[PDB]
Ligand binder design. Structure first.
Ligand SMILES: *[C@@H]1O[C@H](CO[C@@H]2O[C@H](CO)[C@@H](O)[C@H](O)[C@H]2NC(C)=O)[C@@H](O[C@@H]2O[C@H](CO)[C@@H](O)[C@H](O)[C@H]2NC(C)=O)[C@H](O)[C@H]1NC(C)=O
Ligand SMILES: CC(=O)N[C@H]1[C@H]([C@H](O)[C@H](O)CO)O[C@@](O[C@@H]2[C@@H](O)[C@H](O)O[C@H](CO)[C@@H]2O)(C(=O)O)C[C@@H]1O
Ligand SMILES: *[C@@H]1O[C@H](CO)[C@@H](O[C@@H]2O[C@H](CO)[C@@H](O)[C@H](O)[C@H]2NC(C)=O)[C@H](O)[C@H]1NC(C)=O
Ligand SMILES: *[C@@H]1O[C@H](CO)[C@@H](O[C@@H]2O[C@H](CO)[C@@H](O)[C@H](O)[C@H]2NC(C)=O)[C@H](O)[C@H]1NC(C)=O
Ligand SMILES: *[C@@H]1O[C@H](CO)[C@@H](O[C@@H]2O[C@H](CO)[C@@H](O)[C@H](O)[C@H]2NC(C)=O)[C@H](O)[C@H]1NC(C)=O
Ligand SMILES: *[C@@H]1O[C@H](CO)[C@@H](O)[C@H](O)[C@H]1NC(C)=O
Lengths: 160, 317
């Protein structure tokens, strides 16, 4: 996709990441484990929650169509009225469908970018103390216990 | 030792579409299209609908003798004309500008009858009836006919002092023969006029047999108009006039709909009503009907409008 992370160089998702959309998985002597990154996840949740609300708020306004009665000699008026109704429907249906298709693309790409930004943030912090395995992981050149791992996750890793 | 960045994957079967791809698997999505209704006719925020099961709107307005239950007036959010409503104009004849009349009426939210011309004012007979009308007649008008073989010129007046517009009705009878014309009006050549400060209508009869309808060869052409506050209605006739008797005071504004269905009605209240049923929802769209009215979402002709919330769902395995 656009930012190349999701279903990209980070080939698959993690079923074990239950708390949020983005997170970390570490591996050291003490074992393996993953947890969601609160900062990035909560920020994404607020953004999309807003988009949903604004979409709902911008699109929930109804338009009124009354099934008016026409006499035998009002066939032209009848056709003109149908034209209005048909186009009101076709235009709004078009707006609704396109807004959703187009925004869905942006939503998916934004999640991709958020993953990409998290990854690059860690890459920067680590500096030359690690090498990219090319699959979303960083092979640390030094032993790094849970406390060390935590500094990487909370952005206080020393030697950045 | 290593640290990896990753993203969530779930067992969600939700999918959404984009312009460059369709059925994209997503971890979370929100359906924006409401597609359910209760299959009933209910009350809306404006109240209960006026359900006409035996009488058509014009039948009610003209006071067809079979619509007495409606004589006391009603108020409604919207109108429902069951397919069974067949009592309209019992005596053969047509209503001029029927669509406008039905539209004007349905747009109000209530009506209340008001007497325009009391039976006493006439110097001719006023209780004419017909078998086509349940051996009776309309409660909105009086079929004036000769009394004692005399039909003096009738000249009555009514001034709207109710401070509200009055919808009034009248008709012009067209006898099937010259004999019947004379037996009823004493003369074959008459002149009737209905006037106010704004209107100035006059009518002349045309005797002759029309095709059978409700067993009669004769006809009554029906008319209507609106006496505004302060205006004065005046009717003059020397025969053939079907005089205004009672009028209606229309008030308020309803949803202004006329649903023609036999859909079951229930003891319920909804935000949004359609001819197929009602519904309540906070979703922005619905696909129930473009005729929806009340407090409604926007109608859209589709089966689904699924918005992506989460990210692309990618199975690790
Ligand atoms: C559909 O909604 C009816 C009333 O509409 C709106 O309902 C919401 C509740 O989510 C309420 O907060 C709003 O105030 C109200 N809007 C209006 C009409 O102003 C529901 O009708 C309610 O029914 C109960 C049951 O006896 C009655 O006591 C309430 O007075 C009545 N609400 C009103 C204000 O008329 C109705 O139950 C609901 N339909 C469904 C599917 O449950
Ligand atoms: C006010 C009045 O006289 N009403 C009559 C009515 C009218 O005179 C008539 O409709 C004018 O065209 O006539 C009624 O009886 C009719 C018979 O006179 C006629 O021979 O047959 C008609 C049916 O085919 C009808 O029965 C009527 O219309 O019911 C009697 C009514 O009082
Ligand atoms: C990031 O994680 C590190 C490691 O857990 C935190 O550092 C510790 O902070 C406590 C303060 O309560 C100190 O007593 C420890 O000595 C620190 N450990 C080491 C060796 O660094 C750090 O506070 C966390 N930072 C944030 C932003 O929460
Ligand atoms: C019926 O006849 C009466 C009396 O002949 C009419 O009432 C009179 O009408 C004249 C002219 O409008 C007035 O000058 C008199 O003051 C009225 N007096 C009476 C007897 O009421 C009445 O208008 C006639 N009915 C109709 C409408 O034709
Ligand atoms: C409104 O939306 C529904 C659901 O998307 C449309 O589809 C039908 O929905 C019912 C109940 O969910 C299914 O059981 C049917 O199989 C669906 N019919 C099909 C195949 O189209 C429904 O048609 C829409 N209503 C209108 C009037 O367009
Ligand atoms: C997710 O689905 C897979 C395959 O159906 C199943 O093995 C697994 O137990 C499910 N996990 C959850 C969260 O139930």
């Amino acid at each position: 996709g656009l930012f190349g992370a999701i279903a990209g160089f980070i080939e698959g998702g993690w079923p074990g990441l239950v708390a949020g959309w983005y997170g970390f998985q570490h591996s050291n002597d003490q074992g393996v484990g993953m947890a969601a990154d609160s900062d990035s996840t909560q920020k994404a949740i607020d953004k999309i929650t807003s988009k949903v609300n604004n979409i709902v708020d911008k699109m929930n306004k109804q338009y009124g169509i009354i099934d008016h009665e026409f006499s035998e000699i009002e066939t032209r008026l009848n056709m003109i009225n149908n034209k209005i109704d048909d186009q009101i429907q076709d235009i709004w249906t078009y707006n609704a469908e396109l807004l959703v298709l187009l925004e869905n693309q942006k939503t998916l790409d934004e999640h991709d970018a958020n993953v990409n930004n998290l990854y690059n943030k860690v890459k920067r912090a680590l500096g030359s103390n690690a090498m990219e395995d090319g699959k979303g992981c960083f092979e640390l050149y030094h032993k790094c216990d849970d406390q060390c791992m935590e500094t990487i996750r909370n952005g206080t890793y020393n030697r950045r | 030792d290593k640290i990896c960045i990753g993203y969530q994957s779930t067992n969600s079967t939700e999918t959404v579409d984009t312009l460059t791809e369709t059925n994209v698997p997503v971890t979370h999505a929100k359906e924006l299209l409401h597609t359910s209704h209760n299959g009933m006719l209910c009350a809306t925020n404006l109240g209960h609908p006026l359900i006409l099961d035996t009488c058509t709107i014009e039948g009610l307005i003209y006071g067809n003798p079979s619509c007495d239950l409606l004589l006391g007036g009603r108020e409604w959010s919207y109108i429902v004309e069951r397919p069974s409503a067949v009592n309209g104009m019992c005596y053969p004849g047509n209503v001029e500008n029927l669509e406008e009349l039905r539209s004007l009426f349905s747009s109000a939210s209530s009506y209340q009858r008001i007497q325009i011309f009391p039976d006493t004012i006439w110097n001719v007979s006023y209780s004419g009836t017909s078998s086509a009308c349940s051996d009776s007649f309309y409660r909105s008008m009086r079929w004036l006919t000769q009394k004692n073989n005399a039909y003096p010129i009738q000249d009555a007046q009514y001034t709207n002092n109710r401070g509200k517009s009055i919808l009034f009705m009248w008709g012009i009878n067209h006898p099937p023969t010259d004999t019947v014309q004379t037996n009823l009006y004493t003369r074959t050549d008459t002149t009737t006029s209905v006037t106010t400060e704004d209107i100035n209508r006059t009518f002349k009869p045309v005797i002759g047999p029309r095709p059978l309808v409700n067993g009669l060869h004769g006809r009554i052409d029906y008319y209507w108009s609106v006496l505004k506050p302060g205006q004065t209605l005046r009717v003059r006739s020397n025969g053939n006039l079907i005089a205004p008797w009672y009028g209606h005071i229309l008030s308020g504004e309803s949803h202004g709909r006329i649903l023609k269905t036999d859909l079951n009605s229930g003891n319920c209240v909804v935000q949004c009503q359609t001819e197929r049923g009602g519904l309540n929802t906070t979703l922005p769209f619905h696909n129930v009907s473009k005729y929806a009215f009340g407090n409604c979402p926007k109608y859209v002709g589709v089966k689904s409008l699924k918005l992506a919330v989460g990210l692309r769902n990618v199975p690790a395995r």
